[PDB]
């Protein structure tokens, strides 16, 4: 793990890096949010933002420092403070923001900035290619209602890595986390939908825990099975 100011960066794969932003909550401690940075040739693709615009700006600084390549687009998993905190930062940097059509609608409701582009999914939950242009190895998939009704997942094509966001937890998770705007009925199905979408993905990266194995998916499903 390499520390860059207030954020931590860890290389998972040669072209796939993980970022961890920490938010100090008075009386609770430092909360951590993970994200993914993928290098597709001569362009950079970012998955999810940090807690704040400042922290997200640091990520862009790191990308320019190490990779030294421009970010093509940035896609978030859902309209939440732990994932869409640096939307304005990307807009200021001139980066195309991609988000679920529902997320863009929920953004002004959760008190966040909506993305410039909206993603639409089919009946099976797969993203419409028309709304996902020049995504490269970013295969977006909508598992359904889980942590939220707008939560989505992203798979890194060409590799065995998949981003579960905040929908999926680790194999040693004792809690599902925030279940406020979550669905306790379809959660058990959505967790499995993600696993069925990316069965060749062994590296399951989440936003609140280190990259686990496929056991994390089944664990989340089993925990949601009792919801
Ligand atoms: O995923 C969240 C989370 O784990 C948490 C979280 C924080 C503290 C805690 O004890 C448990 C949590 O799930 O923070 C969030 C705050 C948000 O506004 C939206 C979120 O999706 C989260
Ligand atoms: Zn959330």
For residue 87, what is the domain's CATH number? 3.60.15.10
The response to whether residue 82 sits with its C-beta less than 6 Å from ligand 1 reads yes
The response to whether residue 78 sits with its C-beta less than 6 Å from ligand 1 reads no
Q: Whose CA is nearest to atom 22 of ligand 1?
A: 82
Q: Which atom of ligand 1 is the closest one to the Cα of 207?
A: 1
Q: State the ligand closest to the CA atom of 179.
A: 1
List of E strands, the chain: 2-4, 7-13, 16-25, 29-40, 43-47, 71-75, 96-100, 117-119, 138-141, 153-156, 161-165, 203-206
DSSP state for residue 88 in the 8-state scheme: H
Distance CA 124, CA 133 (A): 19
The response to whether residue 48 sits with its C-beta less than 6 Å from ligand 1 reads no
Q: How many domains does the chain have?
A: 1
| Dihedral pair phi/psi, residue 206, rounded to 5° | -115, 175
Distance CA 40, CA 12 (A): 15
- The structure tokens 């529902």 sit at 102
Q: State the ligand closest to the CA atom of 21.
A: 1
188 and 221 Cβ atoms separated by less than 8 Å: yes
Q: Which experimental approach was used here? A: NMR
Identify the sign of the CA torsion 136, 159, 22, 221.
positive
| Dihedral pair phi/psi, residue 197, rounded to 5° | -70, -40
Distance CA 105, CA 27 (A): 32
Ligand 1, from 178, 179, 209: best to mutate by most atoms within 8 Å of Cβ?
178
Element (DSSP H or E) covering residue 127 = none
- Per the structure, the complete domain to which residue 166 belongs is given by 2-225
């Amino acid at each position: 793990d390499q520390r860059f100011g207030d954020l931590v960066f860890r290389q998972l794969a040669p072209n796939v890096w993980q970022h961890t932003s920490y938010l100090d909550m008075p009386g609770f401690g430092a909360v951590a949010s993970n994200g993914l940075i993928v290098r597709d040739g001569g362009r950079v693709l970012v998955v999810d933002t940090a807690w704040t615009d400042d922290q997200t700006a640091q990520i862009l600084n790191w990308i320019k420092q190490e990779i030294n390549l421009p970010v093509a687009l940035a896609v978030v998993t859902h309209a939440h403070q732990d994932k869409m905190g640096g939307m304005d930062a990307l807009h200021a940097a001139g980066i195309a923001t991609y988000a679920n059509a529902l997320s863009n609608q929920l953004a002004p409701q959760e008190g966040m900035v909506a993305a410039q582009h909206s993603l639409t999914f089919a009946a099976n939950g797969w993203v419409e290619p028309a709304t996902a242009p020049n995504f490269g190895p970013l295969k977006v998939f909508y598992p359904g209602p889980g942590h939220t009704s707008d939560n989505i997942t992203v798979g890194i094509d060409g590799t065995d890595i998949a981003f579960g966001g905040c929908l999926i937890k680790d194999s040693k998770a004792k809690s599902l986390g925030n279940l406020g705007d979550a669905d306790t009925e379809h959660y058990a199905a959505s967790a499995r939908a993600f696993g069925a979408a990316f069965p060749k993905a062994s590296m399951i990266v989440m936003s609140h825990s280190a990259p686990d194995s496929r056991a994390a998916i089944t664990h989340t499903a089993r925990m949601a099975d009792k919801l």
